[PDB]
Amino acid sequence: QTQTIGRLTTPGTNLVKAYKTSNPDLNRNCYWLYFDYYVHILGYENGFAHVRIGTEDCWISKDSLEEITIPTKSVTEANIYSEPSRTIIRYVPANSDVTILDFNCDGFYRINYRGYIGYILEDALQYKWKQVDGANDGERAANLVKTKLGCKYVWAMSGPDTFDCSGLMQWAYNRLDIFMHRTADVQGNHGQLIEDAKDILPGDIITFHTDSEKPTAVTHVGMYVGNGQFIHASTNGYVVRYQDFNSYPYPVSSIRRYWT
């Protein structure tokens, strides 16, 4: 499928309602999407853009996002194929200036090279769309939140500069084209369940019971980042901060793995 790149702009605010069809009851949105998130644009219809995050697709107002392209230079000669697979369309010298139109196409960017359109290997271009390093998406997610240490706590925010506990998680996995829902309790009910804290890995999310007088309730979430530490947007300082996993005095509800 041919797709373009969307960056949410939500003019004048931080959120836009999402719907599951192009003719919705505007009062019955399935959830929201947020400022500076990234999506694949599937198409347009009835004033809405059809967007996709990983395995999730929904509809948002065309005014809430902007279609964008990404220029970069190549660092490794390779062939621009007609689809993300090594019919040849052209060739890219040493470091040619190109323009990316789509990403994460089974290892292949979709680009424009001096007027020629097609798919090129990800590692051939200087720009790396995940931004961070890591052995798997879990470690990448962990390194993404580490970049946010010190960011201030604000309710209902998901970046780029302020966060609440659940927004930090959804922001991090949106940067990896992996969708999770917005609230802590829903996040803790999806992805692969890790029943054993000794088996946790960076990028795994942890939900917690933080109210002793409502001990089954789930309002708070963090992400394991290795070495017995997790990171969370916390009201204990109103900041994104490290937290010692073992001495944290609030019980775990679930450990969930959204990376594969």
Numbering used by the authors: 13 to 98, 101 to 274
Paper text:
We report that T. vaginalis has acquired, by lateral gene transfer from bacteria, genes encoding peptidoglycan hydrolases of the NlpC/P60 family. NlpC_A1 and NlpC_A2 consist of the C-terminal NlpC/P60 domain preceded by two bacterial SH3 domains. The NlpC/P60 domain adopts the classical papain-like fold, with a central β-sheet of 5 strands displaying an antiparallel arrangement. Hence, we concluded that NlpC_A1 and NlpC_A2 are dl-endopeptidases with specificity for the tetrapeptides in peptidoglycan and with greater activity toward monomeric muropeptides.
The structures of NlpC_A1 T. vaginalis AG_119910 (TVAG_119910) and NlpC_A2 (TVAG_457240) were determined by X-ray crystallography. Their crystals diffracted to 1.2-Å and 2.3-Å resolution and belonged to the space groups P21221 and P1, respectively. As expected, due to the high sequence identity and similarity (90.2% and 96.4%, respectively), the two structures are essentially identical, with a root mean square deviation (RMSD) value for all atoms of 0.491 Å (1,379 equivalent atoms). A single-residue difference in NlpC_A2 is located near the active site where Leu169 in NlpC_A1 corresponds to Trp169 in NlpC_A2. The tryptophan residue narrows the groove around the active-site cysteine in NlpC_A2. The remaining sequence differences, spread across the protein surface, show no obvious cluster of residues that might influence function. The groove is open and lacks the obvious regulatory elements that are often present in bacterial endogenous peptidases, suggesting that both NlpC_A1 and NlpC_A2 may be unregulated “toxin-like” hydrolases of bacterial PG. Consequently, small-angle X-ray scattering (SAXS) was used to confirm the arrangement of domains within the crystal and that NlpC_A1 and NlpC_A2 are monomeric in solution. The theoretical scattering from the structural models with SAXS curves was consistent with the arrangement of domains present in the crystal, suggesting that the NlpC domain and SH3b domains pack in a concerted arrangement in solution. NlpC_A2 was recently detected from the T. vaginalis secretome.
